[PDB]
């Protein structure tokens, strides 16, 4: 899909890249890592289309800002996975993106600040142990 890319881990490293870019790159069981490549309502439309995972990690490294519609869309993804016990983490948001999330009430509940990680690897380590 052009709107997201599934990422895997280069074995025994903290490097995460397109699963199809290199043969030995491998997804981590229990985690889905998607890099956002277009505004989130495109990826969200893909999500709806295909619809044992404990965590979904969204890599925001390509995202430069978010609009109000995008924030509402993301808040619904996080809510709906959370309602079945699956955490959605946001990896690599810039300070501007977090400002946009904040302005659009994504953190009305401050607990949602615990979904932010600087890197994909930090989010993978953060998924190991947490309130179930």
Curated annotation (Swiss-Prot):
Signal sequence extent: none
Region annotation (Extended region for STAS domain) ranges: 1-132
Record's subcellular location: Lateral cell membrane
Induction behaviour: Up-regulated in cochlea by thyroid hormone T3, perhaps acting via thyroid hormone receptor (at protein level).
Tissue specificity as recorded in UniProt: Specifically expressed in outer hair cells of cochleae (at protein level). Not detected in other cells of the organ of Corti.
Domain of life from the UniProt record: Eukaryota
Role this protein plays: Voltage-sensitive motor protein that drives outer hair cell (OHC) electromotility (eM) and participates in sound amplification in the hearing organ. Converts changes in the transmembrane electric potential into mechanical displacements resulting in the coupling of its expansion to movement of a charged voltage sensor across the lipid membrane. The nature of the voltage sensor is not completely clear, and two models compete.
Subunit structure: Homodimer. Interacts (via STAS domain) with CALM; this interaction is calcium-dependent and the STAS domain interacts with only one lobe of CALM which is an elongated conformation. Interacts with MYH1.
Record's comment describing the protein's domains: The STAS domain mediates dimerization, with both STAS domains latched onto each other in a domain-swapped manner. The N-terminus domain is involved in dimerization such that each N-terminus domain embraces both STAS domains. The STAS domain harbors a unique anion-binding site important for the fine regulation of the high-frequency electromotile properties. The transmembrane domain consists of 14 transmembrane segments organized a 7(+)7 inverted repeat architecture that can be divided into two main helix bundles, the ''core'' domain and the ''gate'' domain.
Family in the record: Belongs to the SLC26A/SulP transporter (TC 2.A.53) family.
Additional observations: The anion-binding site that controls electromotility and associated charge movement in mammalian corresponds to the central binding site of the anion translocation pathway in non-mammalian.
Name of this chain's protein: Prestin
Species of the source: Rattus norvegicus (Rat)
Encoding gene per record: Slc26a5
């Amino acid at each position: 899909s052009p709107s997201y890319t599934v990422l895997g881990q280069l074995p025994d490293t903290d490097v995460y890249i397109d699963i199809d870019a290199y043969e030995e790159v491998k997804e981590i069981p229990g985690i889905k890592i998607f890099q956002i490549n277009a505004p989130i309502y495109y990826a969200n439309s893909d999500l709806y289309s295909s619809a044992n995972i404990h965590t979904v990690i969204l890599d925001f490294t390509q995202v430069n800002f978010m609009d109000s519609v995008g924030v509402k869309t993301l808040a619904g993804i996080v809510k709906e996975y959370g309602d079945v016990g699956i955490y959605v983490y946001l990896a690599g948001c810039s300070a501007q993106v977090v400002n946009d999330l904040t302005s659009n009430r994504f953190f009305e509940n401050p607990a949602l600040k615990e979904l932010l990680f600087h890197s994909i690897h930090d989010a993978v380590l953060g998924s190991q142990v947490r309130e179930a």
